[PDB]
Structures are given as structure tokens and as C-alpha cells.
Design a protein around this ligand. Sequence first.
Ligand code: ZN
Ligand code: ZN
Ligand code: ZN
Lengths: 164, 48, 73, 114
Amino acid sequence: HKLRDQVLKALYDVLAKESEHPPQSILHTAKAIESEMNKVNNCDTNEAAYKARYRIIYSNVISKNNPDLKHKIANGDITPEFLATCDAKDLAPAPLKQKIEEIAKQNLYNAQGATIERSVTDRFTCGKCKEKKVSYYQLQTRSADEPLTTFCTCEACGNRWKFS
Amino acid sequence: DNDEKLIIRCRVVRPAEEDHMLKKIENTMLENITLRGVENIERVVMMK
Amino acid sequence: NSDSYVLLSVEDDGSFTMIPADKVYKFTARNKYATLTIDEAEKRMDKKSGEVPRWLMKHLDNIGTTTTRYDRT
Amino acid sequence: TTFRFCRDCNNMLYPREDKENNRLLFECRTCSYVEEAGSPLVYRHELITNIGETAGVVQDIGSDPTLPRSDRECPKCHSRENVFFQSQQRRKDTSMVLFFVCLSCSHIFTSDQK
Ligand SMILES: [Zn+2]
Ligand SMILES: [Zn+2]
Ligand SMILES: [Zn+2]
């Protein structure tokens, strides 16, 4: 019964330590035994993941920022809900939440790569689709006896060609 | 996870001569421990 | 710079004799702190230890090997 | 993070721990001088830095004629003369932020507004 006494003592401590005092100490130990008996419903002290969820909820309570989690957990937000929530990112607090969304947006942008854009004109005509959406580009390849190559590519379909 | 500064605290446990051992062990854990993925693969990007 | 220097040493009456300098020598202290030995120094230099002990000199001094000149005297 | 030296003999101090009183005592490996440590910080690797775009300033940067000249003012002395020049650090990802140094207020100021 080591875990089912230790977590109960943990909730004894983290509810007595609140500015929200326990004169309804019997209500609060009812809350604690409800919390622990839904907490075991994932594991029943038979799975190694038992301590992880406990650490999540425990350090969320003892976080401060925020302390208002104590008030909302004593005035509602029932404990069998908060095994199945797994809302650790979602709670305690919201400024950190919007920080996380900004971070995720930044990462999702920065994982995108190179997108060289291939300026087009209507001067030539494609070979596959015969459209004047030529992704043209110019550069020199051969020896000194000639000017540039007149490289060609169609952007409407992907058709690369060359002019003489 | 939710703390403002993510921290790791570790110690050597055994039932003088600390600094260079701990520095080498630090260097080892930085250089060797894989996290996920498959090694010999590097940065990856998405084209549309 | 041993050539360009010249000496203004006051005498008891206030006289200033010009002594043209010849050479300048620099002195440092040595073996004030129980210096070590070249052979065991080579064994510490070699890769017998990935890092030598920080207080290895203190351990050698506690052993008493190669003590100070003042201590030997 | 600095490397203190023994004041009796200018030598690199090393950290070594008290056996029972549980305090870092910087004992000289040359002489017997010892000193307690202000902080438990010893070593620091710092695998990421972003530093070096600013310094290298002499008191007469503007004495060289090769630097360009502008008309933005120093926001302490309001004199319209100035000397501007880019970062002194050169990596492949250093910024096009600019550094503005004046002669009147003799002060360094930038053009970033984030
Ligand atoms: Zn085409
Ligand atoms: Zn010393
Ligand atoms: Zn100014």
C-alpha cells in the first residue's frame, strides 16, 4: 500500500499548503482518494507509467506559475477527468501556451526549404503543352567562340528544352 | 516540462578525483547518446 | 638595450658619477616550491592517464619525494 | 569563470574539494596558498554563442578617412554627424544590423526597432 499511502499524503500536503485552507478536510481527503482511485485506474500500481502522470499533475500543482490551479482544482475540474485529460501542455498557464504555439509556428516555418521561383515570360512556346509560360533562365556553357546557350524550361507543365 | 528552464540533475553514485572523471563522462553523454531517428541522416526539408 | 643606458647614482655629497652600463641581467627564483623530476614527468606526460590527478603534486609532497631546498637544508 | 592566480606566486589555481568541511578550496599547486570559492561554478562549455559584432572600437575610429559618413544623429547629443559601419563579427549568418558611432557624444547606437 506504499503508493496508495504516499500519493494520499502528497495530496494531503499539496492541499494543506494552499492559501485555500482545508476546513472541509474530509471533503479534501475525499477529493484525494477520488484522485488516487482514478489515478490507479490507468495502472493500479502495475504499470511503470503510473509515476509519470503523477509527476505531471503534482508538479503542475506545485508549479506556481500558476497558483490558480489549486483554486480551480479545489472548486471544480474533477479528478477522474484529469487522468484522461493529458492536458499538461494545455494548462498552467496560457501565456506559456501561446508561447508554445508561437514556437511551433516558427519551427514549422523554418523546417521548410528552398523555393527558387523561376521568373517566367511569354516569349517562347512549350514543347509538351505548347504554352507561353516559359520558365526561362540564362547562363553560359561552351567555349569562347559563342554567346550564351538560351536555356529554356516550361513552368506550366515542366517541359525543359533549348533554343538553337 | 512546464518549468521556465528545463533542467537535468545527475550525480555519480558509488559506495578527491572527481573533476576529470565527471568531465569525461559529460563529454561522453554529449557525444554518444542518440535520441530518436536513424543516424547518418541530417536536416530534412519539405518541398511542395 | 644594454648599450644605451647610463647611470645617475647620487653620492653622499650629491655627486652624480656617470657609469656607462655594459650588460643587464635578469634573475628569477627557482626551486622555491619543491620541483619535480624529469623521468616521472615523462611518465605523467605519456598517456598512462587520460587526465593526471589535480592534486598529484600534493600527493607526491605528502609522500615527501623531491622536497624543497629549504626543507632539505 | 575567470582563472584566479595565487597572489604569492602567479600560477594557475586549481579547484580541489575539502574532505570534510564540504567547500571548494582553490589550492595552489605551486605553493601552499589556498582560497575558498565564491560559487560552486567550476567549468562551463557554452556550445552556443552569438557575440562579437560590436567591439574593436578605438577612441578615434573617425580619424580614419575610409569609413562612410551619414546624417542620422546621435540620440544623446543630437549632432547630425556620425560614422556608421556594419558588424565586426563575420559568420555566414550574421545580421545586416548596423552600428552608428558619433564623435560628439562618442557613443555607439543601433538602428534596430524590434
Ligand atoms: Zn509546357
Ligand atoms: Zn601559490
Ligand atoms: Zn549623441
